[PDB]
Paper text:
Guided by the insights that Vps4 is active as a hexamer that is stabilized by binding of ADP·BeFx and the VSL domain of the Vta1 cofactor, we used S. cerevisiae proteins to prepare a Vps4-Vta1VSL-ESCRT-IIIpeptide-ADP·BeFx complex for structural studies. Vps4 subunits A-D form a right-handed helix that is created by the three very similar interfaces formed by the A-B, B-C, and C-D subunit pairs. These interfaces each bury ~2000 Å2 of surface area and appear fashioned to coordinate ATP, with R288 and R289 from the neighboring Vps4 subunit positioned to coordinate the ATP phosphates. The D-E interface (~1700 Å2) is similar to the A-B, B-C, and C-D interfaces at the central pore region of the hexamer but deviates at the nucleotide-binding site, where the large AAA ATPase domain of subunit E is rotated by ~15° so that R288 and R289 are displaced by ~2 Å and are no longer able to coordinate see the nucleotide phosphates. The Vta1VSL dimers, which are pairs of helical hairpins that form a 4-helix bundle, stabilize the ring by forming struts between adjacent Vps4 subunits. Consistent with their more clearly defined density, the Vta1VSL dimers bound to the β domains of subunits A, B, C, and F also contact the small AAA ATPase domain of the following Vps4 subunit, with Y310’ and surrounding residues at the hairpin end of the second Vta1 subunit contacting α6 and α7 (residues 300–330) of the small AAA ATPase domain of the second Vps4. The primary contacts are with pore loop 1 (residues 203–209) of the A, B, C, and D Vps4 subunits, whose closest Cα atoms are ~7.5 Å from the helix axis that is defined by these loops. The peptide lies approximately along the helix axis, with Cα atoms modeled 1.0–2.7 Å (average 1.6 Å) from the axis, which is consistent with the model that substrates are translocated along or close to the helix axis, with some variation allowed to accommodate distinct amino acid sequences. Pore loop 1 of subunit F is displaced ~14 Å from the helix axis and is therefore completely disengaged from the substrate.
The AAA ATPase Vps4 drives the ESCRT (Endosomal Sorting Complexes Required for Transport) pathways that mediate membrane deformation and fission in a wide range of cellular processes. Vps4 is monomeric or dimeric in the cytosol, and assembles to form an active hexamer upon concentration at the membrane/ESCRT-III surface. The central pore of this hexamer is thought to be lined by pore loop 1 and pore loop 2 (residues 203–210 and 240–248, respectively), which are highly conserved in AAA ATPases that act on protein substrates and play a critical role in substrate translocation. The leading model is that the upstream factors recruit ESCRT-III subunits, which polymerize through their N-terminal domains to induce an inherently unstable membrane configuration that resolves by fission following Vps4-mediated disassembly or remodeling of the ESCRT-III polymer.
Author numbering:
A (entry chain I): 280 to 330
B (entry chain B): 119 to 364, 369 to 433
C (entry chain A): 118 to 364, 369 to 433
D (entry chain H), E (entry chain S), F (entry chain R): 289 to 330
The structure:
């Protein structure tokens, strides 16, 4: 129960990070910065598979 | 009857504030959501009563209070430490009682207090009678026996939150740290503070600016933009020589010997009919070389202490 | 004919709404209910308590317990801060105290509450011992009057700083009670009270998981994590794009992009009432737990263990 | 197009975020993808 | 001691009760035991 | 039952407490037992 409870906390943390990276990607396209975007929108996706 | 009331009408939009989406969220749900949706707040679900803002100087705290004051559509009171501390013995405290009293009379309402550190600090016996009487009335009158804690809202600001006493820290039940702005927020403040002035740069050039300006405050941005707006006056009145360009006559500073370069001083030139060269990137970088960041980093370590604990 | 401003209306909070407090609950039931319901027991040698102090760290439930006594009083509940006692000139600062206990005895049976007694007391030098030593002295006589008027009134004192309270007034408040931070079960109870009529999602042992997660809060900390928990579904209503009908004629709630009946809209688009908020989930609770670390500090708890360990 | 394609990625990446607010990994892994592919289509 | 041992059993048997208010049989079966053993220690 | 069995243990463990208020170890050692056995009957 203790280990599963922490796993829930940990997955919640990863989801927060994925959403953060997406927000940062969006913010980046507001300067047409495709570089940053294609990267954060990726570091994020890979991590949603790491879930 | 004392009646030391004061309130006013400023003008600051939401979106002129950069970053701070947690504070924007908490104040929209603390201001707009009670007025627009009073039916959601009923019984067990109650609005927030005490909200604290804190951080390093010039991260946008009082300007955010201006934005709440414009976007309030409510009786926005505001009081410093001046109007609370009275002469004799008794009006120092009864004015606090009348402040929250008439604040509840004009409900729904919002109360802002700037630099609440001048009213706290019960530890020790320094600042004895003013701290115990006035601070005691702030506690009990803020919530107590029969105070209607619903309705009004107490906005606290400070620069020193660790000297704030833990009891008033509990009174301000939802506290928010306001950091230095990051890259994108300072890009936004650059693109706001250029305003209607015809600039020369693009958005990623403002990104180059914010990358160059790592770790400023909002006032630092305001003065490098100010200096950037004060370079063309220096060039339009500098040395000798202006020139016509283009609604009837219009002259700007130009180098000695140029296409239509007359020799004169700004003094020689007629009201209005003088225009300065549009802000340029060099003026920005010159303003970056003009001024350090204001804040110190060990104070940032204490802000990370109180923020890391109570934020 | 220089009367004051008092309490008349009682703020309705129930007696069961508080948690812990069993010594204070015992002392106030035997100090309030037992004299009125059983006046024949208190006679001669057996006398009711005259001075009761509450104290402790901020937000352990002191003034809220005073609210509970105020609702459950069925008596003329006076209440006075340090404001109404300290007057302008020289004389009304003290005669108002005399009229306070006087008219308090006129409306007997009755209860008197004084919050933040350290603002009443507190001497350091000549300025602190002027126009507060007089009012303190009148309190000293008017609560020496246990041999004068034993029955009738009761003085309830509250504070957050009991060590700066003077020893004479400490003797005046003859039965003092420390109010600690609450434990697991009391915070489980305050969770189950402060959820109220809102349709929750959890069970009792899930509230036990909450109180286990929240080791060492105050009552205000509980009030604001429950408050934030009551703000999270409206944050879901404000958030994203997309609602959905469920189920008395049309009712829509926020749902993820692309779902069973997921229309794309904003809360603004949706009709009065016919909104459905998300039921409080443990995730909103745990997010609210991560939102606010405890308020009170543990060295202040060491001073409460100092004054409690001595005088409690 | 383009000025819009760049605008639709954000539209996607938002929905994706909004989706993770219900832990819906399915939708997410998809929109966060339809978006990325499109940033390469740029 | 004793005057206290008799007081700590009650302290236990209370916690035990308080525990069953969350159906926590574990804690209960334990405190209601640490208590009993101690009433025999009397 | 059960929802009640869990309620009767408390009923017991209370009586037991109430009993120690007269130092009555006999009653106590018994109710605190009839209770425990029953928490195992759960
Ligand atoms: N985030 C911001 N967005 C816009 N202007 C800002 C921001 N932060 C600071 N400023 C500007 O910098 C100045 C300092 O902000 P202000 O709130 O007055 O600081 P303080 O709270 O310390 O008084 C103000 O004139 C304000 O216009
Ligand atoms: N035992 C309790 N049960 C329910 N709510 C409580 C309890 N203790 C404190 N609270 C809540 O916490 C807040 C603080 O209670 P109160 O006695 O007024 O403390 P304080 O005067 O020190 O701020 C109030 O909003 C009250 O509703
Ligand atoms: F002027 Be700020 F409030 F630091
Ligand atoms: F009554 Be509390 F400690 F403010
Ligand atoms: Mg300020
Ligand atoms: Mg209090």
């Amino acid at each position: 129960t203790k280990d599963e409870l922490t796993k829930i906390m940990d997955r919640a943390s990863k989801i927060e990070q994925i959403q953060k990276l997406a927000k940062y990607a969006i913010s980046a396209l507001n300067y047409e910065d495709l570089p940053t975007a294609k990267d954060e929108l990726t570091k994020a996706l890979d991590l949603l598979n790491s879930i | 009857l004392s009646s030391a009331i004061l309130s006013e009408k400023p003008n600051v939009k939401w979106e002129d504030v950069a970053g701070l989406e947690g504070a924007k969220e908490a104040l929209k749900e603390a201001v707009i959501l009670p007025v627009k949706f009073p039916h959601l707040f009923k019984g067990n679900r109650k609005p927030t009563s005490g909200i604290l803002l804190y951080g390093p100087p010039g991260t946008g705290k009082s300007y955010l209070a201006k934005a709440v004051a414009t976007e309030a559509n409510s009786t926005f009171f505001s009081v410093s430490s001046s109007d609370l501390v009275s002469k004799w013995m008794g009006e120092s405290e009864k004015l606090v009682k009348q402040l929250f009293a008439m604040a509840r009379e004009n409900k729904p309402s919002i109360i802002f207090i700037d630099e609440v550190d001048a009213l706290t600090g019960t530890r020790g016996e320094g600042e004895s009678e003013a701290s115990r009487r006035i601070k005691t009335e702030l506690l009990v009158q803020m919530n107590g026996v029969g105070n209607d804690s619903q309705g009004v809202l107490v906005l606290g600001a400070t620069n020193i939150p660790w000297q704030l006493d833990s009891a008033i820290r509990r009174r301000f039940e939802r506290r928010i740290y306001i950091p230095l702005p990051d890259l994108a927020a300072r890009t936004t403040m650059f693109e706001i503070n250029v305003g209607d002035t015809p600039c020369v740069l693009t958005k990623e050039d403002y990104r180059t600016l914010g990358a160059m300006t790592e770790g400023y405050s909002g006032s630092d941005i305001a003065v490098v933009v100010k200096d950037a707006l004060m370079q063309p006056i220096r060039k339009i009145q500098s040395a000798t020589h202006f020139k016509d360009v283009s609604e009837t006559r219009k002259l700007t500073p130009c180098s000695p010997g140029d296409d239509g370069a007359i020799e004169m001083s700004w003094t020689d030139i007629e009201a209005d009919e003088l225009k300065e060269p549009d802000l340029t990137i060099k003026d920005f970088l010159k303003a970056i070389k003009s001024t350090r960041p204001t804040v110190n980093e060990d104070d940032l370590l204490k802000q990370e202490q109180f923020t890391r604990d109570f934020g």
